[PDB]
Amino acid sequence: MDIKINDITLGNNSPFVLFGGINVLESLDSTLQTCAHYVEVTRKLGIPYIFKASFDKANRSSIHSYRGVGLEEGLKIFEKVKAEFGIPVITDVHEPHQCQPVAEVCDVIQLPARLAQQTDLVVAMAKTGNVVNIKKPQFLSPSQMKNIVEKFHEAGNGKLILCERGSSFGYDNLVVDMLGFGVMKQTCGNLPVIFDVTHSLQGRRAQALDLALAGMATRLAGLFLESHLLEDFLIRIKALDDLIKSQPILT
Amino acid sequence: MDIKINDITLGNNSPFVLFGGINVLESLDSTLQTCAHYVEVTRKLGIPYIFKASFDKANRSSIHSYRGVGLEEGLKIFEKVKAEFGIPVITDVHEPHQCQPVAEVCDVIQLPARLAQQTDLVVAMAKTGNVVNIKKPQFLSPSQMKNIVEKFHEAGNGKLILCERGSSFGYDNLVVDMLGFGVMKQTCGNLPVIFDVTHSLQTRRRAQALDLALAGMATRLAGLFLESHALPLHLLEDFLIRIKALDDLIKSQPIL
Amino acid sequence: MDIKINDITLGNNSPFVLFGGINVLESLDSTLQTCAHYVEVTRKLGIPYIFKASFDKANRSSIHSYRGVGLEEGLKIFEKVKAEFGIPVITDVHEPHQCQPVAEVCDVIQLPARLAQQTDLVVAMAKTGNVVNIKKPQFLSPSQMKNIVEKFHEAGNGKLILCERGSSFGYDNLVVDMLGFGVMKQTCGNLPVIFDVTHSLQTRGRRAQALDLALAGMATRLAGLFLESHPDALPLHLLEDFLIRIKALDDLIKSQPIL
Amino acid sequence: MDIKINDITLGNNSPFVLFGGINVLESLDSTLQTCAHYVEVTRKLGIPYIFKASFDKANRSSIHSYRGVGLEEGLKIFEKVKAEFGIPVITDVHEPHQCQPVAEVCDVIQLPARLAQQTDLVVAMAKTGNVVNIKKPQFLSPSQMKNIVEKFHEAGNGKLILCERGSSFGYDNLVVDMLGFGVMKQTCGNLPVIFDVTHSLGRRAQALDLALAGMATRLAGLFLESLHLLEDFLIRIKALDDLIKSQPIL
Ligand SMILES: [Cl-]
Ligand SMILES: [Cl-]
Ligand SMILES: [Cl-]
Ligand SMILES: [Cl-]
Ligand SMILES: [Cl-]
Ligand code: NA
8 A cells, every 4th residue: 555645655666765854853954954965865866755853752861851842843843844845744743632733734743662552642643634654662563563553544544654663682682573574564454664774773884774775675665764874875775675666576 | 778658668678568459440349349358368468558550541452442430530539449448559640741640649650661761751750759660661671770760860759669570572472580670679779679470471370470470579579569350359368378478488588 | 290319209399409510520529529518518408419510511612621521431420429429410411322321320311402302312312211301492482392202202201300491582691481380380291390590590699690590480389400509600608508598488389289 | 705615606795695405305316306496497597506405304393203314325315416417515414423424525514503502513514624504593692603603713614604594582483683694794704694594484475575685785695495486586586686796885
């Protein structure tokens, strides 16, 4: 099943879409500068691109780390990003009451992994009618994603993306099960599956590349980066993706 | 470090405390009945007791599943429990705005395992000043609990209980690492460590719960956390006679 | 099901048996000194005791580190242990040809975890008619132990002990699943289950850990505890204090009927 | 570091080599038939090929289950394969005393994963001087492979292949950590790394996804088992491998 995001086609047999940006929104000027770099590199390669940032990040590593400019200023920044570049945007929501006003502006709304079974948030997100990115918890097996999908369907929204971020592997360590992509496709109606390589990890750039290439080899809708260098990386991913997506799914 | 919960002393070298009750509050009458049974059994066995229930099941499989009585009615039921039995109570909170009104009634407030890294909730819970039970996420290692403790400390609340509930082991399965209890004691300032045997089984019986509970309590713990309806309620007394026997033995031996 | 090992009764509802000794036989005099210490402490506490050592260490830290004294001299040292102290002994075998000569001297023969699905070794061990200790591989689940048991039964030997030694938990780390003991008892006919606490740690002071882990396991009602000490692995001089604690817990548990 | 196996160049920046065959040798005729098929598919696609089989099934479900032809007859069959097709062959050895006679016939000798820390078997394999395929235990981290490599080096043999076969993931399950390939290359001197997709695991769809993902990390070779499913798989793997190997290392 493909999902249209403005003029982008997102789907497991379409050219991959890059989801990338910055961790937390701080100012209009800085956001535009980073966004402009993603836009320039992706336009030069012909890769569809969706800008990501948090306006209120609720899971930072310290309680006084800056959580972002907050809802009202964050949405004003996202509006400017959209007007200036003509691209879609994505952000995470963690409070049910924020879903509607965020959805007025942000094309894709993201369900944080830890909150993925929180029924009130699921329902509030679903009711926006927007495209939703469902982050797979590291403690949930790929055959359980279908339960989350079901809850969205019950709440009236089938525009769902499933986003892999690794699985717990002993203590303090994540492994990405490359077989889980196919499990999610088969059990969840071939919804678009994208791969958050950045959170899947924890030199490092060489790791991100191997891991990204390995995941994209399985035929995926997109690559998600919590992130010369970007360009070189994307050249390699696009080479692999172009090859994979050009061959028909096996008989 | 011990924690006083009204007249109860909770600590890793004190007699174990039972945190026991039910999954979710369904009605006043059923709650009082179950609670009365826990109280009667624990008083006669001389086991200190805190009543547990959720007022909301927030992460059920269906949008149409029963969720429990909800905050307003739930707090009314907790108020009646406290007035009728004179015992402390514990319940979980899922949203920052719930913390202060819940804490006005419930002695211990609990941080759900999945939400344990949500900073907004941590801060809102810390600011209540109440005793907090931190459910250890299945996906976090015992050495990383200190990071959560640090956040609460930075927010000004040091009255924290660490609650084991098992670790992810491959897909859809949990294992309890009996070494993790000591790791938590050593790295988190010997705060009280309790064991939720009920949720540790998770994805596996009365025989199993008893073996697992005894194993964990053998490592010298401040308490045991459990649900009945989950253990059959009528087996509670026999179960607790066993856990107390072991706990009395273990706590009577000097540490080292 | 109980197993008689000379005058010892090994079983899940019997007083726990200590299987203790050393990693590898390296000498005579030092073996006897270590054994004597175990003997003295266990006799003083009334704990049944079986001396353990390998004569040939299969997985060595380096290719030239000493493998141990080998079969022939190893068996001679086991003979001396048995003659001097009157106790049973346990050792591991690695090749089918070793099974007969080791079984003639040793009261229990041990199937190494890494070799536990090697059919030729299983058959050769089973055919000795000796008591066998089966080490549970870290990569095998507890419900699969029944398949090894089956193969022994097909080959004519039901005198089997199951030994826990942890499960792989992510990379280079072991967890002991305390529920696996009961799984092994339920699926394998209530054969004796013992716990190798020494190899369960492995990848993790260590003394405080060994005690916590041993106490936790023994709380589930087990036939025995399997450990290694070093003569200066638990410090040998702390053995009495360690055993006092294990005995206290075991005596309590075993004194209550199963629920 | 590349390894020459007759006229095949095996290495992490060379075109991938297929190691394929059957589980256990049952008879000459079946073996030649299966081998002929692999040879015919690989030749037509231009993929270097090494025939694999075990002469013994060391873990049988029953004490009475079929065992395979055994060492003596097995080696005779490997000799015929080599004479008829002119290709290298690979087999596993489980006991030290087997190493020298097997190594007389088989080009590559394989160290089984559960036996990879058995020091007597390591030394006896090293001493053959043959190319050795070291199966990574499911219970070992990729950073520990350097310790096994060290032992082989100390015993005088540096012709070593490292082979991924998955890691224990809870009970009765395996996962393949795609980051382990790079860890093994960086810590073990860029020895050839290959991927046993068969033992890492409809199910044919799984093998293809997994094989593609692993080969995307740039590897020396693959293990695979067999309406023309083998050829359809290999067409895809070769396309990907050619692409990956054509990009400069970053
Ligand atoms: Cl997560
Ligand atoms: Cl709970
Ligand atoms: Cl959890
Ligand atoms: Cl041993
Ligand atoms: Cl093992
Ligand atoms: Na004997």
